Amino acid sequence: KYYGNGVHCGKHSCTVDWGTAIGNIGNNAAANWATGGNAGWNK
């Protein structure tokens, strides 16, 4: 399911093996990067 390039599909876009990390990143970019990321994404 998760082993390589495009396999994990997975949000219909086929979310890439980085999926949930890039999810948390993009979420806290929208929430907190107005401060420059003073708290940031997953610490």
Side-chain angles (χ1 to χ4, degrees):
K1 186 60 62 179
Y2 298 101
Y3 69 75
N5 180 259
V7 55
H8 38 45
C9 207
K11 284 70 176 177
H12 312 284
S13 55
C14 311
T15 197
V16 189
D17 68 91
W18 64 40
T20 190
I22 301 308
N24 187 283
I25 284 161
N27 182 259
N28 289 279
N32 188 241
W33 244 260
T35 70
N38 181 64
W41 61 60
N42 48 223
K43 306 190 73 63

